[PDB]
């Protein structure tokens, strides 16, 4: 099970991911 | 100009903040 | 701009705070 | 469980990796 | 640029400060 | 629980590792 | 240019200071 | 506790441990 949170707005680039 | 995200991702717990 | 990202990774507590 | 958190905001890159 | 990354991991608490 | 932390601000780059 | 790391384990408080 | 730090910062590189 792989779970991804991302938002990227030009200057602000956030990506979070979790494997289970 | 900002970014906000609060989220619970499977078993993690995540919050994001950009304050102009 | 002032930036915060924080995550609880089971017991682990990570705080990231940036001034760009 | 493995968590990978990746962020870039102004002239900063921060990467955190935490294996539970 | 001022970066603070701050982390607690079992009995261990760690402050990392980068100032450029 | 094992932790890797990496911050890069232009040329300034620090990698930090925390194992209990 | 400064980078500063400070670790705390119960009765143990150590710091490392690194500059250009 | 095994704490590593390695930093590449202007025209220098500084490594260090803390073993608690």
Coordinates of N, CA and C in Angstrom, one line a residue, chain A residues 11-12, chain C residues 3 20, chain D residues 8-13:
Chain A
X11 N 6.8 28.6 -6.5 CA 7.7 28.6 -5.5 C 7.5 27.5 -4.4
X12 N 6.3 27.0 -4.0 CA 6.1 26.1 -3.0 C 5.9 24.7 -3.5
Chain C
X3 N 7.8 29.5 6.7 CA 7.4 28.3 6.1 C 7.4 27.3 7.3
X20 N 12.8 31.8 4.2 CA 13.5 32.0 2.9 C 14.0 33.6 2.6
Chain D
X8 N 10.7 21.9 -1.3 CA 11.5 23.0 -1.7 C 10.6 24.1 -1.7
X9 N 11.2 25.3 -1.2 CA 10.4 26.5 -0.9 C 11.6 27.6 -1.0
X10 N 11.4 28.8 -1.5 CA 12.6 29.7 -1.9 C 13.9 29.2 -2.3
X11 N 15.1 29.6 -1.7 CA 16.4 28.9 -2.0 C 16.6 28.0 -0.8
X12 N 15.8 27.0 -0.6 CA 16.0 25.9 0.3 C 15.4 24.6 -0.2
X13 N 16.1 23.5 0.0 CA 15.7 22.2 -0.2 C 15.8 21.5 1.1

